[PDB]
């Protein structure tokens, strides 16, 4: 019987899909047979690392549905996920609360 290529490596993200995208995206003339697996592992690691902080935020905000504001918080509150997404803008993410100290009353 068949056995999905993304299940032989303990991954959730599809490996046949990533392989077809690498093949038909015109990145190189030939694609190693283990490159899609590595890339899919890295993709699911990053998405889990951001979804975890998003869930932590949505829970510490007494909701139970991850929502764009929670992703904006999870990203801009980190320090390395902030450099990976320094140029992006997350639609409906608002901004991070911050007020300068020269402005706060004395």
């Amino acid at each position: 019987k068949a056995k999905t290529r993304s299940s032989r490596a303990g991954l959730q993200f599809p490996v046949g899909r990533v392989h077809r995208l690498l093949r038909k995206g015109n990145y190189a003339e030939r694609v190693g047979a283990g490159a899609p697996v590595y890339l899919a592992a890295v993709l699911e690691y990053l998405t889990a690392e951001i979804l975890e902080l998003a869930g932590n935020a949505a829970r510490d905000n007494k909701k139970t549905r991850i929502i764009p504001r929670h992703l904006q918080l999870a990203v801009r509150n980190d320090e390395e996920l902030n450099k990976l997404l320094g140029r992006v803008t997350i639609a409906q993410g608002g901004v991070l609360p911050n007020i300068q100290s020269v402005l706060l009353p004395k």
Partner: protein, 94 residues
């Protein structure tokens, strides 16, 4: 109708193993999907550029590793490369 594709069900299968009770919205799902696409394109493009300078004709599991180690910041790089090599080992010996 024509069937378009995305990463919805896979992001959902990952959410249902990182937070087994939370549930994602719709706009947040589209945001995560475009995020995955953007990082995919970044990594594959850098991997191609790198498999070009060296005059190789293929984009192997090591061009991808060096790409991941260039693009991703300081500590995300180590964990990303560890997860990648673990997955590739668990896959090749099966």
């Amino acid at each position: 109708k024509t069937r378009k594709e995305s990463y919805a069900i896979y992001v959902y299968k990952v959410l249902k193993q990182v937070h087994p009770d939370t549930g994602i919205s719709s706009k947040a799902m589209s945001i995560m999907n475009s995020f995955v696409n953007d990082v995919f394109e970044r990594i594959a493009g850098e991997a191609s550029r790198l498999a070009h300078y060296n005059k190789r004709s293929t984009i192997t599991s090591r061009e991808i590793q060096t790409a991941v180690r260039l693009l991703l910041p300081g500590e995300l790089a180590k964990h990303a490369v560890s997860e990648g090599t673990k997955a590739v080992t668990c896959y090749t010996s099966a």
